[PDB]
Design a protein around this ligand. Structure first.
Ligand SMILES: CCCCCCCCCCCCCCCC(=O)O
Length: 110
């Protein structure tokens, strides 16, 4: 609605990743969370919304934006670790403060 599906994504992904609320809560000032469990929380989000490329593991950023210049390079990031791939993609694309806080608010708060 879209607060209801995001709240559920957050609960499922906190469980799967083992990321604490405090670790994720760092997003409130616009900083992309850096804790290994928090990086895995981000991958879990992409996996649950089905925005992870089956072929390569690239993050399908344009597909994410359907769900709500720089998209193509950031959507072609592949690392040996799925959590690092998710973290590097967000860092690349959501490089502005307000961009991060908006998704943070959607996932993290009431
Ligand atoms: C801890 C928050 C920071 C990470 C959030 C920024 C990058 C990805 C955001 C995922 C959006 C999930 C909302 C889509 C779910 C839906 O469509 O219902």
């Amino acid at each position: 609605r879209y607060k209801k599906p995001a709240k559920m994504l957050h609960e499922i992904c906190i469980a799967e990743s083992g990321a604490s609320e405090e670790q994720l809560r760092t997003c409130l000032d616009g900083t992309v969370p850096t804790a290994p469990a928090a990086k895995c929380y981000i991958h879990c989000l992409f996996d649950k919304i089905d925005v992870v490329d089956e072929a390569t593991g690239r993050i399908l950023l344009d597909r994410l934006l359907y769900i709500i210049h720089l998209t193509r390079e950031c959507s072609h990031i592949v690392t040996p670790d799925k959590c690092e791939t998710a973290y590097e993609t967000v860092k690349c694309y959501f490089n502005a403060h307000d961009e991060v806080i908006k998704f943070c608010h959607l996932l993290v708060l009431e």
